Amino acid sequence: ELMPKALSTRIVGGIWWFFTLIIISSYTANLAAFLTVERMESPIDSADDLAKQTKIEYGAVEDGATMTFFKKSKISTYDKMWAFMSSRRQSVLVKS
Amino acid sequence: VLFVIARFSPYEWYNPHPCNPDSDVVENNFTLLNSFWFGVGALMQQGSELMPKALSTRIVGGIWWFFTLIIISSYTANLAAFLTVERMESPIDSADDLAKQTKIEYGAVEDGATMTFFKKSKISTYDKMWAFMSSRRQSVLVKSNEEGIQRVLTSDYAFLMESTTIEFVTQRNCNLTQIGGLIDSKGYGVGT
Amino acid sequence: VLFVIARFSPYEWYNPHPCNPDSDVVENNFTLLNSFWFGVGALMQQGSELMPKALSTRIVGGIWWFFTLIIISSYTANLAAFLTVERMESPIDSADDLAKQTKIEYGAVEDGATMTFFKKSKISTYDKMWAFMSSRRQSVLVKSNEEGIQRVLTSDYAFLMESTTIEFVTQRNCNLTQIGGLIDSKGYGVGTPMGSPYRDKITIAILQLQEEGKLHMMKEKWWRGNGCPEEESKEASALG
Amino acid sequence: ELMPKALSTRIVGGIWWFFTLIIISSYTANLAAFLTVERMESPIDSADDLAKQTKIEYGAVEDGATMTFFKKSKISTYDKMWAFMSSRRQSVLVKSNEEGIQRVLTSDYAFLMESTTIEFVTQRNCNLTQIGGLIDSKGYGVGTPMGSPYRDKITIAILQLQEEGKLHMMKEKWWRGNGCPEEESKEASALG
Amino acid sequence: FSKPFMTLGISILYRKPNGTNPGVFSFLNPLSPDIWMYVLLACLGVSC
Amino acid sequence: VQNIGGIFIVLAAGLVLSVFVAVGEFLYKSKKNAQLEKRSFCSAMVEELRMSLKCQRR
Ligand SMILES: *[C@@H]1O[C@H](CO)[C@@H](O)[C@H](O)[C@H]1NC(C)=O
Ligand SMILES: *[C@@H]1O[C@H](CO)[C@@H](O)[C@H](O)[C@H]1NC(C)=O
Ligand SMILES: *[C@@H]1O[C@H](CO)[C@@H](O)[C@H](O)[C@H]1NC(C)=O
Ligand SMILES: *[C@@H]1O[C@H](CO)[C@@H](O)[C@H](O)[C@H]1NC(C)=O
Ligand SMILES: N[C@@H](CCC(=O)O)C(=O)O
Ligand SMILES: N[C@@H](CCC(=O)O)C(=O)O
Ligand SMILES: N[C@@H](CCC(=O)O)C(=O)O
């Protein structure tokens, strides 16, 4: 209802207006930055993206029909999967 | 709620005629009609002329502002997020891009020239493309061109067909593009 | 439509002079030029002063106020993405659109194999290339291959190179692109004279080296120049 | 509270509003830019990340365990970073871990090395730490000339020196555990 | 061998179930609990 | 147009639905005019005539 008159009272509100421009705007920005990186967040489903991230300890059982498939593999993802499994050792390449 | 508080507030039932000292016969600004156009105006962030003067009423719309302040901003943020990642969508632009996507299968017409060509490709990408064609060889490499038209149009499949038919596919179905151009160029000849 | 409802609704015209009694002059603030201002004043998220009094007029305001709210936050939302995703193109793509403007001056070697393609071109776009290649024969037609490469970096000039010669000029100059499709499609036949005795001897030797792929084992490393780290990690730009 | 009434006052303010409507919606959208590219950055803590973004100047020792490993690694990203080390030279390979420490501390350089030293690098000089994880598992043993009659003698000697448990006794006697109270457990989010 | 009585292929054994529901203040999370105090500190102060 | 354009229908529907209530406002106060002096129809003309008088704009 009230706007200030009286330049003294004007300027105080105007800078208080200037502050609530920013904080309302800044809130809208990083909320998107959360909600963008959530859509950037991808739960892995292929072996393909799983073949590049060695951050999961993944492997298989030694002497397995699973294993020897990777061992004779000539396939882009499954090469890179079998690239490190023999290379680390039974630490990740279990017997059970 | 604004109307109901305006039925039972002390600093409501103030007078009309704000300029006349007389004429006390009460003013009841927040009606159930007026409280509609109040909150929707804050919900659309435009506001109505009628602001709360009663301190009971001033807590109502002020926190009702904090409803709309969040929701409109949160509406913007997911919309800014949704329109971001669909622009972050960049599809395959090479056979080498597609030689790794095991989730995106690829074969050909069974026993066509590509089935020869990828098999004898000493080009490191297309060499490994034959290996993928070697692995799921039963599923991939359908009987004819139409069947490989079909399974791209029913699944995620790449169907390494030939350009002179590709430049016919877009003449009938522009559902189907040409990612990359012309792995090898050849020529139709009549076989004596 | 705001003026339409304001001149048919009775829950409308309310007398000024509140402090003074009845005063039967009849006034509402609505005119067209007022409604020219309240709609824009809603459109800028401002509000003029006026609060439409009929609920019918509040349908006109509120739906417009809702249409206000939908458009403007959608504007902010996309405008992040252009700054964020930054799908940068210096595009001009095909044969047609690249001939619509002549800042993309068609570099081709005079008396060239490119020239012989453009001389007897039967495709309508490629036929009309030959109209203005010979016109600016001085400028748009270069003297050699290395001559055309240097002009592209200096000017906004554009020079025509074979696909595998494209392959290494992009490789030796990492900030230099190929633009468009695969226009020509021919091969590198090894030159012997007419009626030469040297045809089949050189022919089978090529086929014997393509047996192990010696030509490609040569091709993979002679077309392996500098690094060219294809795409680079960007950062947000303060708006200019 | 002020009001344009005649058109000359109207046409200015609304286009001034149209000037206004850009700038704040520009500013929100571009402040959104300087936050997402903070959050789409990378605490690169893996060798696979550290290979791809060619920023961290990453090197090793020439003539060491690590060089020969990536010379002989059959892992693609390790083959990839070896191709960086193939394209690079003594420039990043410098040698002799003390040459590696200096470029890490002074420059953006990243140094391929092994655990217990990098462990003891974390212990003093609290600016440097192990970035990532343990790729493989070698072991400190004693070098032995081929077929010399000492190998089985010292293996019993070392293992009974481990039956003492002396290895982990003189571990802290020669690692001295140290200070550096972890120093890094923040900076994820939250503009403050 | 003879016959595939239990024919099959290979998939991946995993879960990572750690996220269920935020529920709590999460719209609070974009600025800071420092800020939401300190921004309301200012409005309480400037209104005087 | 594909991206948002259904709001223009939601826009226009507000312009559609407001017609129903604006004529609802006229006849209901005309009923109050037809309650006091007039009958049903000589009510609904005489304020509509002075709507055409329209109290000159400028
Ligand atoms: C493929 O295109 C045809 C016509 O071009 C169309 O009728 C059909 O719906 C399209 N299929 C899909 C899945 O979009
Ligand atoms: C782009 O910049 C280069 C030099 O930086 C210049 O040679 C070229 O003409 C520019 N392209 C334009 C203006 O289209
Ligand atoms: C290393 O750490 C010490 C103490 O933590 C500090 O004084 C010194 O500046 C650091 N070196 C840098 C930041 O280069
Ligand atoms: C997932 O939850 C379990 C149970 O609380 C916990 O032990 C595990 O560490 C969590 N995984 C993480 C934090 O990656
Ligand atoms: N069926 C497998 C054992 C299970 C596995 O390796 O996954 C075999 O016969 O070797
Ligand atoms: N046209 C090919 C068959 C289809 C293909 O291989 O693309 C041929 O002559 O065998
Ligand atoms: N322990 C290493 C030497 C030190 C190093 O290369 O880091 C080796 O046996 O080669």
Swiss-Prot record, chain A:
Origin superkingdom: Eukaryota
Q: How is it modified after translation?
A: Sumoylation mediates kainate receptor-mediated endocytosis and regulates synaptic transmission. Sumoylation is enhanced by PIAS3 and desumoylated by SENP1. Ubiquitinated. Ubiquitination regulates the GRIK2 levels at the synapse by leading kainate receptor degradation through proteasome.
Localization recorded for this chain is: Cell membrane; Postsynaptic cell membrane
Q: In which tissues is it expressed?
A: Highest expression is found in the olfactory lobe, piriform cortex, dentate gyrus, hippocampus, granular cell layer of the cerebellum, and in caudate-putamen.
Where are the bilayer-spanning segments? 15-35
**Binding site residues for L-glutamate:** 65-66
The job of this chain, per UniProt, is described as: Ionotropic glutamate receptor that functions as a cation-permeable ligand-gated ion channel, gated by L-glutamate and the glutamatergic agonist kainic acid. L-glutamate acts as an excitatory neurotransmitter at many synapses in the central nervous system. Binding of the excitatory neurotransmitter L-glutamate induces a conformation change, leading to the opening of the cation channel, and thereby converts the chemical signal to an electrical impulse. The receptor then desensitizes rapidly and enters a transient inactive state, characterized by the presence of bound agonist.
The entry's family comment says: Belongs to the glutamate-gated ion channel (TC 1.A.10.1) family. GRIK2 subfamily.
Give the misc comment. Answer: The postsynaptic actions of Glu are mediated by a variety of receptors that are named according to their selective agonists. This receptor binds domoate > kainate > quisqualate > glutamate. It does not bind AMPA without coexpression with GRIK5.
Q: What is this protein called?
A: Glutamate receptor ionotropic, kainate 2
Task: Write down the species.
Answer: Rattus norvegicus (Rat)
Curated annotation (Swiss-Prot), chain B:
Question: Which parts of the sequence lie on the Cytoplasmic side of the lipid bilayer?
Answer: 7-62
- Residues bearing carbohydrate: 175
State the encoding gene. Grik2
Per the UniProt entry, what species is this protein from, by scientific name?
Rattus norvegicus (Rat)
Specify the protein name: Glutamate receptor ionotropic, kainate 2
Positions with a binding annotation for L-glutamate: 113-114, 162
The tissues where this chain's protein is expressed are given as: Highest expression is found in the olfactory lobe, piriform cortex, dentate gyrus, hippocampus, granular cell layer of the cerebellum, and in caudate-putamen.
Q: Which family does it belong to?
A: Belongs to the glutamate-gated ion channel (TC 1.A.10.1) family. GRIK2 subfamily.
Q: Which residues form a coiled coil?
A: none
Q: How is it modified after translation?
A: Sumoylation mediates kainate receptor-mediated endocytosis and regulates synaptic transmission. Sumoylation is enhanced by PIAS3 and desumoylated by SENP1. Ubiquitinated. Ubiquitination regulates the GRIK2 levels at the synapse by leading kainate receptor degradation through proteasome.
Task: State its role.
Answer: Ionotropic glutamate receptor that functions as a cation-permeable ligand-gated ion channel, gated by L-glutamate and the glutamatergic agonist kainic acid. L-glutamate acts as an excitatory neurotransmitter at many synapses in the central nervous system. Binding of the excitatory neurotransmitter L-glutamate induces a conformation change, leading to the opening of the cation channel, and thereby converts the chemical signal to an electrical impulse. The receptor then desensitizes rapidly and enters a transient inactive state, characterized by the presence of bound agonist.
Cellular component, GO, one term? hippocampal mossy fiber to CA3 synapse
* Highest taxon above the source species: Eukaryota
Q: Which residues lie on this side of the membrane: Extracellular?
A: 84-192
Q: Where in the cell is it found?
A: Cell membrane; Postsynaptic cell membrane
* Sorted UniProt keywords: Cell membrane, Disulfide bond, Glycoprotein, Ion channel, Ion transport, Isopeptide bond, Ligand-gated ion channel, Membrane, Phosphoprotein, Postsynaptic cell membrane, Receptor, Signal, Synapse, Transmembrane, Transmembrane helix, Transport, Ubl conjugation
From Swiss-Prot, chain D:
Specify the protein name.
Glutamate receptor ionotropic, kainate 2
Q: Which residues cross the membrane?
A: 15-35
The protein's superkingdom reads: Eukaryota
Q: Which organism is it from?
A: Rattus norvegicus
What does the UniProt entry list as the effect of changing residue 127 to Q?
Loss of glycosylation
Give a short account of its post-translational modification: Sumoylation mediates kainate receptor-mediated endocytosis and regulates synaptic transmission. Sumoylation is enhanced by PIAS3 and desumoylated by SENP1. Ubiquitinated. Ubiquitination regulates the GRIK2 levels at the synapse by leading kainate receptor degradation through proteasome.
Residue ranges annotated as Extracellular topological domain: 36-192
Residues modified by carbohydrate are 127
**Cysteines paired by S-S bonds:** 126-180
Q: How does it assemble?
A: Homotetramer and heterotetramer with GRIK5. Tetramers may be formed by the dimerization of dimers. Assembles into a kainate-gated homomeric channel that does not bind AMPA. Can form functional heteromeric receptors with GRIK4 and GRIK5. Can form functional heteromeric receptors with GRIK3. Interacts with DLG4. Interacts with NETO2. Interacts (via C-terminus) with KLHL17 (via kelch repeats); the interaction targets GRIK2 for degradation via ubiquitin-proteasome pathway.
| Binding, L-glutamate | 65-66, 114
So which tissues is this one expressed in?
Highest expression is found in the olfactory lobe, piriform cortex, dentate gyrus, hippocampus, granular cell layer of the cerebellum, and in caudate-putamen.
Protein family membership: Belongs to the glutamate-gated ion channel (TC 1.A.10.1) family. GRIK2 subfamily.
Miscellaneous notes: The postsynaptic actions of Glu are mediated by a variety of receptors that are named according to their selective agonists. This receptor binds domoate > kainate > quisqualate > glutamate. It does not bind AMPA without coexpression with GRIK5.
Intracellular or extracellular location(s) = Cell membrane; Postsynaptic cell membrane
Q: Please name the gene that encodes this protein.
A: Grik2
